[PDB]
Design a protein around this ligand. Sequence first.
Ligand SMILES: *CC(=O)N(c1ccc(-n2cccc2)cc1)[C@@H](C(=O)N[C@@H](C)c1ccccc1)c1cccnc1
Ligand SMILES: *CC(=O)N(c1ccc(-n2cccc2)cc1)[C@@H](C(=O)N[C@@H](C)c1ccccc1)c1cccnc1
Lengths: 302, 302
Amino acid sequence: SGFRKMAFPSGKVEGCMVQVTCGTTTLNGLWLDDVVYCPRHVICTSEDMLNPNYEDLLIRKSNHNFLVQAGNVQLRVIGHSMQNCVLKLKVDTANPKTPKYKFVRIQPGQTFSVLACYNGSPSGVYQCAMRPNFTIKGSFLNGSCGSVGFNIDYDCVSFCYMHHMELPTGVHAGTDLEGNFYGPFVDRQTAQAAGTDTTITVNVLAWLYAAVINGDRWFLNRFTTTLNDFNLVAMKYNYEPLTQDHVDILGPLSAQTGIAVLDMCASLKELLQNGMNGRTILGSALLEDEFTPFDVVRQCSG
Amino acid sequence: SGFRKMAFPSGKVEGCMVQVTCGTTTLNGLWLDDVVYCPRHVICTSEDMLNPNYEDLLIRKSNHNFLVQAGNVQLRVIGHSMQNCVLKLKVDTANPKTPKYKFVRIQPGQTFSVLACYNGSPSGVYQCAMRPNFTIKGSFLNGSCGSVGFNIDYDCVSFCYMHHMELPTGVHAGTDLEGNFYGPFVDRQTAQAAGTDTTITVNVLAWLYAAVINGDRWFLNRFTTTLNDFNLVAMKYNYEPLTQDHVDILGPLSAQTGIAVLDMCASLKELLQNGMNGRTILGSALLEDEFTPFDVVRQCSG
Ligand SMILES: *CC(=O)N(c1ccc(-n2cccc2)cc1)[C@@H](C(=O)N[C@@H](C)c1ccccc1)c1cccnc1
Ligand SMILES: *CC(=O)N(c1ccc(-n2cccc2)cc1)[C@@H](C(=O)N[C@@H](C)c1ccccc1)c1cccnc1
């Protein structure tokens, strides 16, 4: 029993984290095979943040302009390029600790562990979710950039996120490892606003399903409801629409709890309309939406 | 900006987690140097859980009775003993991945990362705190036992917790790595109850201090208060007494925020007496007490 925001073990990613440098600018990179990956904003100066021309800037730099440091050691940059918003710095040496990996672009609502890195040294791990507005509510400080998000597929590390910037909202924007931003965010110092953050509906139900399995069942109502009925109420409180996929994805938890999906929805509808009256579910005084059904299955099954 | 329940990177502990076996009973062990450590309850059968005599039982077993498995490999047990509630199984081979380590008995209110392990395979990481009743509100399933709690001291891993059992409360009891239980719990199948769980007061203030630093400052009142005044109100809602040590330990956050300790206390007093009115602090609808001042400094400083 018990339910916690749980991260993947970070061991196979610790061994891939390097320090990358330009002048007064050190950030984190990710050394996989004979390539090191970091945010291309490591080439910028404080003068050229308002509107930088990254192509032009990279022209000014050469292989030897970039100080890649592995713990106490240094790597020879035998070639650089730019893939969208990432520097791919080629190196003489292949990481001997390179785990099997993939690069996946994750979908909003999906979750991943973050290994928060300063000066190429892993500092800490936490679980995070792509919000529907394509921000993340991270915990990053100055120097955090190039810190990565990942899932672990049996023995295969999937990298889904690279940290690039904090918004004035105090939330976080980043790319996949092919260097495309999640959302409309750009890597320049201009006015950018995160759109309306909406609740992830399948995740909240996942979590109610976790709650039941943990014996917290008070919120369960004698009622049920319909998709359309439920999604009319949903929209009113900034919630994602529930779909038949969403329903199907909750089958294993439906199946384990004995509780139909649509009866859980009816419980949520009453919880949305009445709030929680100071009552808590799984130690929270509000509805949690940063666990998927998989996260719930993994933690509540094995 | 941002504040999350953050774990230490688990890399140096992954390499110490082994599978330990007896008949129908497999749990986790911890291989440091030429010693493997696990809960001594791996020697028990379902018949001898109500009141087991561990000495007597161990008499029945020998070195070769215990199947220690490292991933795909097997270790030769060249000697066993019992230290309080842990098996120290001596092995031919020293762990080549043994990080510098210490064994510390942690104090109630202090926090540590847990590496949740099934069948000697690390499954996930989360941050946890010793509650004042000396339970932990973990996330463990069947097979979790021998999973360890640790802090990372620069490069030195400190092991503070080994998981032994779940209470009917659905909360968790375990030992230090010398095999003494945190609290009055015993490793037998008898009626055991976790006493009154009290809130960790320094931690809540730590967290309010994190909140301020993140710009969440609404709860700040025009008032202040006294220790005695504050601790009279504290006791009423099952809260730890605040001491001058507690005050001193919050100096760095006092110092960073510009806010006196005793003015933060006055804010807490009004928050305790009035609740939060549906207002949230750092994304929580209730007062969080599983971060220490150190955790707050580490995450909000670097
Ligand atoms: C790496 C880093 O920690 N941050 C950061 C600094 C500089 C830049 N940059 C873009 C173009 C040239 C240089 C990106 C990121 C800071 C940070 O992002 N601050 C925000 C307000 C910001 C500044 C400048 C441009 C864009 C954004 C940081 C702070 C906290 C968490 N992550 C990053
Ligand atoms: C290792 C394990 O996961 N659990 C466990 C099983 C058996 C024993 N045991 C004590 C004396 C002989 C055998 C200890 C722990 C279960 C578990 O602890 N279940 C509880 C209810 C319990 C059963 C029997 C004795 C004592 C406690 C488990 C389940 C969930 C989380 N941790 C452990």
